[PDB]
Amino acid sequence: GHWSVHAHCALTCTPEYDPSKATFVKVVPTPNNGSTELVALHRNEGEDGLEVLSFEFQKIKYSYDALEKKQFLPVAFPVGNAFSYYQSNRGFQEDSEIRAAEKKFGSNKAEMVVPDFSELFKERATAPFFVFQVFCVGLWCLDEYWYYSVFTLSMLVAFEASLVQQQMRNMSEIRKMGNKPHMIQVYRSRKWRPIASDEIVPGDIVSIGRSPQENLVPCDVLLLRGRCIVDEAMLTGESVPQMKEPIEDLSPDRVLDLQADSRLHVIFGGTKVVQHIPPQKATTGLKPVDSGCVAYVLRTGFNTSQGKLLRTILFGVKRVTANNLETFIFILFLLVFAIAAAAYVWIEGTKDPSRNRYKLFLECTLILTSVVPPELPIELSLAVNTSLIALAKLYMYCTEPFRIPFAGKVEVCCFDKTGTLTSDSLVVRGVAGLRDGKEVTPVSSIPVETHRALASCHSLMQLDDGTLVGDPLEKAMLTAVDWTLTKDEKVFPRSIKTQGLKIHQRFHFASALKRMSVLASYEKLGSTDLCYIAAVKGAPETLHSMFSQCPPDYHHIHTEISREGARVLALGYKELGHLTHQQAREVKREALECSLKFVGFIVVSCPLKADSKAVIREIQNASHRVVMITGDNPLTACHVAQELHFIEKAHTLILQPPSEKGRQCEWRSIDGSIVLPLARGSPKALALEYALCLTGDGLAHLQATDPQQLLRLIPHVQVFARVAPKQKEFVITSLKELGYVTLMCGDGTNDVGALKHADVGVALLANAVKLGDASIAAPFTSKLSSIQCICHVIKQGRCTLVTTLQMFKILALNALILAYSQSVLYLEGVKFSDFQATLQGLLLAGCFLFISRSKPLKTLSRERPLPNIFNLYTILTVMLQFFVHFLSLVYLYREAQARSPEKQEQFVDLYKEFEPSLVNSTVYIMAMAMQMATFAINYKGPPFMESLPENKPLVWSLAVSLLAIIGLLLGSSPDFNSQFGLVDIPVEFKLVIAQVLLLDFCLALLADRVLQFFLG
Secondary structure, eight states: OHHHHHHHHHHOOOOOOTTTTSSSOOOOOOOOSSOOOOOBBBOOOTTSSSSEEEEEETTTEEEOOOOTTSSSOOOOGGGSOTTTHHHHHOOOOOOHHHHHHHHHHOOOOOOOOEEEEEEEHHHHHHHHHHHHHHHHHHHHHHHHHHHHHHHHHHHHHHHHHHHHHHHHHHHHHHHHHHHHHHHHEEEETTEEEEEEEOOOTOOOEEEEOOOOOOOOOOEEEEOOSOOEEETTTTTTTTSSSSOOOSSSTSSSSSOOOOTSSSHHHHHHOEEEEEEEEEOOOTSOOOSSSSOEEEEEOOGGGSSHHHHHHHHHTTTTTOOSSOOOOOHHHHHHHHHHHHHHHHHHHHHHHHHHHSSOOOHHHHHHHHHHHSOOOOHEEEHHHHHHHHHHHHHEEEEEEEEEGGGGGTTTEEEEEEIIIIIIOOOOOEEEEEOOOOOOOOOOBBBSSSSSHHHHHHHHHHHEOOOOOOOESSSSSHHHHHHHHOOOEEETTTOOOSSSSOOOEEEEEEEEEEETEEEEEEEEEEEEEEEEOOEEEEEEEHHHHHHHHHEEOOTTTHHHHHHHHTTTEEEEEEEBBBBOOOOOOHHHHHHHHGGGGTEEEEEEEEEEOOBBEEEEEEEHHHHTTOOOEEEEOOSOOOHHHHHHHHHHHEEEESOOOEEESSSSSTTTOOHHHSOOOOOOEOSSOOSSHHHSSSEEEEEEEHHHHOOOOOOHHHHHHGGGEEEEOOOOOOHHHHHHHHHHTTTTTTEEEESSSHHHHHHHHHSSEEEEEEOOOOOOOOOOOOEESSSSSSSSSHHHHHHHHHHHHHHHHHOOOOOOOOHHHHHHHHHHHHHTTTTOOHHHHHHHHHHHHHHHHHTTTTOOOSSSOOOOOOOOSSSSSHHHHHHHHHHHHHHHHHHHHHHHHHTTTOOOOSSOOOTTTOOOOOOHHHHHHHHHHHHHHHHHOOOOTTSSOGGGGGGGGHHHHHHHHHHHHHHHHHOOOOOHHHHOOOOOOOHHHHHHHHHHHHHHHHHHHHHHHHHHHHTT
């Protein structure tokens, strides 16, 4: 197709080589991603007299640097600007350069336009099945069946339009899940105007902050002033919130680099801001009305990190064809047998010179159309649509309906720790260090000193409504304390008879200091004097030295708590004696750290959802493999995997990159007991001995060093930590290339890159709706935060895959039987009247529609489904059933012929009208028995899908077919078989026909079940 695309461009305009004035430029796709396309260069008047050549491919603008590089280059950004420039920046002052920068940098627009319905229909027309159907329809048009052909073509195009409409209403859900652009308070023309997110352009100054609507940050912005709490779990995967500092404090001599200074100074897009700390009024500078953090827009549009990943998916890869190689080779096999039967008909007809040639050719071509049914794609589409409707009842959507059958063949399942397995809400297990040993004591039994240390030291604030907002760590910290936090900064006990504490000065976290200090005073009991006590909390390793008295087991308890992976944070409290009112202002906020007293630790971990463990166990009992791919700290990921029984080995070892170049990588255990360098051999023995986990840094080092060892190692790794969004995609592609079908369940925008490439990708919604970005590029989307959707999808996919295998088997056998019967007996002059053929067609269509609507069982099983129709079992059973049925059909035909009156014509008149006989009636009875036996036999029942009796429409269809066969065999009503145009047969002959029918049925069932038992 792509090679065909450039032919049209060449026809339209001739290629140009001279760079003076080029009408169009061909785009090189590169083998990794992209597609071949043509873009038109844009001529712009130069204010300085210099013209710039530019083009837009995949919403990326490039430029041709005639001055220095003499080649096409992407548009330069303020990424490389000096760090001192932003200190004196006042923002955009005139609208002329605002428009200019909007032109030469782009716009912050991320909104989809859904692909056109006409374009979707044209793309659907490229399916070879539709072309084959049109060929067949025109072929019956040639066969003088013009009205029937027109009706069939109309039905086919109507159903295709219905399929496209279903895909479109699915696409509507994705469009709704797109982030609706939101108003932003922005500075322009020396004034603050409210401005929508789409029209933001780089270079402006924007005052961001915590919004009441819990909206995401619009674009990558540079924090000029103010401090804020950001939760980049959606975008970076780090569950722990991180601090952000203003740039006004730093020296101007530095040069800003995104790689080095990403974590502490640039706020990314798509993340959620939690708390905003307005700057002091003493500092003179940008003054916001909303009192949010004023900041500088670095990047916009799809050039932001979230934009990069999103776009690189959006125009990255094609939708995988619903016409796989399996169906192609199945059609090839059916057509091979079709051509064999056609050649037999042609040869024997040409053996008769009296008969015309064009008429026989038309008859043979009609046979070739009849052998390959027009419902071959229609029936599969019906089964898939029924599965999708059944799945939609579980509050889950499917934007790519054809990938449901792929769910059965999944062998490895991947999960994201944060947002999918671990809930956002965090609860405190207890307050550690207040009792002997490593045991943590509940909040009930901790002393009152710990109560006041926990309550006083917090950065939370109160709104007009009074709702508590802030760091979830501090949220649970205050919830366990349960003391009410008033708007007057007074902390009052709900159930304790203690005087409240009023905070005078609060100093927030400093990344340089790794400590956060709170100064407050309490009224002494029985007196009006104010006693000032400050409780400071922060990094335990740094805060250790500030303790005047420290227990000997401080480091030991800290290490043991850290091994558990829960966020450990030391609590401090100093007596400080008595302080005056003026001295409280005089004493600096950073001066309280000296001469501290240890009070204990607080342990906080993310609790798993209740049903996560059951789902993981159920998946593991289905001969499946489960792997964790998350970006949190490796210790926390290993602990969470251990709790969910991802890993059952006694110990698990970390793999780390070497600090010194040329040093072989060596595993270290979490406990550090076992250390062993990597061996060049297979990791099978190490995996058997203990669980294996790989970090992102180690993955990058191995990728740079040797891909081969990484590809061997990846299949046996249980936990992936500190993995980048591109590294997720690399891991998933590595698993997929080995042949394993990959399934992943993630919600953050980290998982999008890998979800797009996953065979069956499921996106979740944490804390269940904003309907986040990951659902846009995920084939499947669920509105339930739980992971039970994975189990439901696996069950549905197993049922659909088994149904598709059964459909292929039944279609193949029926097509072979019908093709041979027509080819040999129309040549023999044995044809049914139109009424019985119509009954055959309607019964077949009904029974297929009934089998396509199967229901799945509630519980999955250990047995694995057949990976594909291309196995020895399917071909062998289809062929063997064909022979066992063929022998019976030939026996019945010979039995009927030996007694029929001897033929009066050596040749056969092909257009002689129907006449009732013994032979035609016997053939019709045998064909109906054929259909009955096939639909009874090829229903692979439990444990994979509902039992045969449960499918009530199918039971009724087979029962009515059997009743019709029995009635025709008995012929109780002469009017009945008179209407069917079948002469009565003597009972003596009824005996033999019934005996051979029962023998054929029993032989087919026995052989099929024996083969299933042997090659199960």
